[PDB]
């Protein structure tokens, strides 16, 4: 019988991110007029959503799991630009033109900053 | 004489003398006990006089329990002074007793000497009281 | 007085725009700080008299 | 590793009195060091001039 003594770094990392995501969400919130752009990052992919916090409903969502994004022959940040452009097309196809950015806890920079600037040049303003 | 080591507040209002006792109305340790039938403030001087009276009757054997403690101070202002200028310094410690409370207990092998011993203690207290046992 | 009252003046128009306090033991020198000067109309360096 | 806050650190080479040699990295600017006791020399690992002075003049 094996009995681990402490906490794996995965558990420490996970609870620390949710800790600093809630500290973020004490200010930003989603409304139908000005939705919220939630981004989730992993070691393989990146996800975005447009959430309306008034009733807890998701408007549009783009992700790196889509077949067309996988075909890109760049690095991880090259797929983040592709994912950012998809959400901007889907955001404006539902009448949304202004959003607020929810970085999800992660540091703003690198992959996250690549996605946001891809969705800024594509029409969304935030 | 029983005296608390320290009390947080030295000069306190008078304990209220309304209602009947909520807890302590039964015998837990000994075989016989003294149950109160009136409200009063039982001073530590009366408690000491009332458990010595129990001691002098059972002599050697047996055990005595005291279920109340003089926690609450009563102040007296200095003699032959006019009213005013503060509140007096505490003098004697009392225990707020309500009807139904069990004050003393005793555990002695025979009954007559134990019931006689508790009666000597009742005559030292400023209240009506009775002897109770552990049975319903 | 340890904490006396000091007047900060613009370094361009020499107008006495603010008054505050400082500890003249922790800050033996004249306090240098930027504050809005209404006469100039922009944030300018203000130095203690 | 920050740039200009750490001691200068270069690969070295240790040579012992038993002929053993390693290939390690340390802080010594020389590039090599020589030691007379190693893992192969000290008695506690192996289990095997004052000594020579009494063993030469007196026997």
């Amino acid at each position: 019988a094996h009995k681990p003594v402490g906490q794996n770094i995965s558990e420490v990392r996970r609870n620390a991110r949710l800790r600093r995501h809630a500290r973020l969400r004490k200010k930003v919130a989603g409304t139908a007029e000005v939705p919220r752009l939630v981004v989730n990052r992993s070691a393989r992919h990146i996800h975005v959503q447009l959430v309306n916090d008034l009733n807890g409903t998701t408007l549009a969502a783009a992700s790196s799991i889509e077949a067309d994004v996988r075909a890109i022959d760049g690095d991880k940040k090259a797929h983040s630009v592709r994912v950012g452009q998809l959400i901007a097309e889907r955001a404006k196809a539902a009448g949304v033109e202004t959003v607020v950015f929810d970085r999800g806890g992660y540091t703003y920079g690198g992959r996250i900053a690549a996605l946001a600037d891809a969705a800024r040049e594509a029409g969304l303003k935030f | 004489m029983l005296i608390p080591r320290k009390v947080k507040h030295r000069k306190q209002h008078h304990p209220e003398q309304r209602g009947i006792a909520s807890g302590g109305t039964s015998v837990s340790f000994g075989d016989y006990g003294i149950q109160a039938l009136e409200h009063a403030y039982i001073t530590n001087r009366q408690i000491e006089s009332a458990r010595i009276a129990i001691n002098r009757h059972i002599k050697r054997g047996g055990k005595v329990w005291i279920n109340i403690f003089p926690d609450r101070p009563l102040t007296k202002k200095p003699a032959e002074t006019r009213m005013g200028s503060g509140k007096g310094s505490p003098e004697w410690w009392v225990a707020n007793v309500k009807p139904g409370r069990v004050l003393f207990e005793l555990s002695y092998p025979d009954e007559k000497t134990a019931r006689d011993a508790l009666t000597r203690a009742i005559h030292k207290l400023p209240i009506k009281a009775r002897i109770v046992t552990r049975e319903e | 007085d340890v904490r006396p009252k000091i007047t900060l003046a613009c370094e361009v128009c020499k107008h006495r725009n603010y008054i505050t306090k400082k500890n003249r033991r922790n800050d033996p020198d004249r306090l240098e700080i930027k504050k809005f000067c209404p006469n100039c109309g922009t944030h300018q360096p203000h130095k203690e008299s | 590793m920050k740039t200009g806050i750490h001691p200068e650190y270069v690969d070295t080479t240790v040579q012992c009195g038993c002929g053993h040699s390693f290939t390690t990295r340390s802080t010594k600017q020389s590039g090599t060091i020589v030691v007379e006791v190693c893992s192969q020399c000290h008695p506690f690992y192996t289990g095997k001039g004052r000594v020579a002075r009494f063993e030469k003049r007196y026997g």
Binding site: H2, P4 | - | - | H6, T27, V35
Partner: protein, 182 residues
């Protein structure tokens, strides 16, 4: 390209050595070494500033990186200690730089101790970590004995993934720590 000798030795001579001895279910349960931390509690730095300055000078030579200067987190009158002033130093080592230090500590410094009699195996930290101290600091070849002022020992501690002390000893003796027979 290449690896430190201990990491090379640990990778495919030590890892599977523990496999049959303890009969693990996953390779993820094989213990390793996490980090090594070198400490010097100066203590008497409350009296002079030169004391703390000397310790951080030597500790860079021993390991190969700049140390911290651990400040006191409490004011103690009995020790003439006021919170907020240097009291010690600390260096942690990870990755390659850890393995060389473990290489040199066993090979060179440890046998250089006068009348060396190994290290006690009972100093384990309950859950599989080992710590030990030195009364001096001259057992390192990266210092010059002439320049040495006073003894200033360390507190070497080795952090492992082993669950218990039984598995903690097994990993450390494989590296080559000279445990006494007791």
């Amino acid at each position: 390209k290449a690896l430190p000798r201990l990491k090379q030795r640990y990778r495919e001579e030590i890892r599977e050595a523990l496999q049959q001895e303890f009969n693990y279910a996953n390779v993820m349960q094989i213990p390793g070494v996490v980090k090594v931390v070198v400490n010097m509690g100066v203590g008497d730095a409350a009296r002079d500033a030169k004391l703390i300055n000397g310790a951080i000078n030597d500790l860079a030579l021993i390991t190969g990186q700049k140390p911290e200067v651990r400040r006191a987190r409490k004011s103690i009158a009995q020790f003439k200690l006021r919170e907020g002033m240097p009291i010690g130093a600390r260096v942690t080592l990870r990755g390659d730089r850890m393995w060389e230090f473990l290489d040199r500590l066993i090979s060179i410094a440890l046998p250089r101790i006068r009348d060396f009699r190994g290290l006690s195996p009972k100093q384990f930290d309950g859950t599989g970590n080992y710590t030990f101290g030195l009364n001096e600091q001259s057992m390192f070849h990266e210092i010059d004995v002439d320049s040495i002022d006073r003894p200033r020992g360390m507190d070497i501690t080795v952090v492992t993934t082993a669950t218990n002390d039984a598995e903690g000893r097994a990993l450390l003796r494989a590296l080559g720590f000279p445990f006494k027979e007791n």
